[PDB]
């Protein structure tokens, strides 16, 4: 339907839910309008998420050879990867569990007039 490019950032050490809070700002926006929402968004997941939209636009510019002023984030989502299990010691001998969660972030930009 449209020419496109894909970029994946596997094993990003941001939680999947705290990454989904920030991908819902830039879904369906143009790339020049998405890399500056993520600049002035105070959340910390906008670091790793904006390094994938910028590389999906760099993959569509170099490899496919597309005009960068017409791109748009057509499909972006975040999944989970593996989880490390840690121990946080608590009162009266109880030992609880901490989960270090990771993510996979997929951005599919596309060129459309």
């Amino acid at each position: 339907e449209y020419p496109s490019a894909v970029a994946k950032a596997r094993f990003v050490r941001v939680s999947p839910r705290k990454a989904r809070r920030v991908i819902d700002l830039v879904r369906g926006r143009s790339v020049s309008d998405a890399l500056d929402i993520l600049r002035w968004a105070p959340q910390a997941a906008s670091g790793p998420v904006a390094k994938v939209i910028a590389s999906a636009a760099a993959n569509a510019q170099n490899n496919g050879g597309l005009d960068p002023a017409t791109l748009v984030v057509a499909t972006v989502y975040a999944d989970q990867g593996p989880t490390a299990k840690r121990i946080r010691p608590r009162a009266q001998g109880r030992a609880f569990r901490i989960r270090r969660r990771t993510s996979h972030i997929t951005v599919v930009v596309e060129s459309r007039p």
Binding site: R21, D36, I37, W40, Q43
Partner: peptide, 22 residues
């Protein structure tokens, strides 16, 4: 209902390079 609120962006032309700030 747990979600980030988006900020507003305006136009700035300093040193001949157009940017976006709140």
């Amino acid at each position: 209902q747990w979600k980030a609120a988006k900020t507003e962006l305006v136009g700035v032309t300093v040193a001949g390079h157009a940017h976006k700030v709140p």
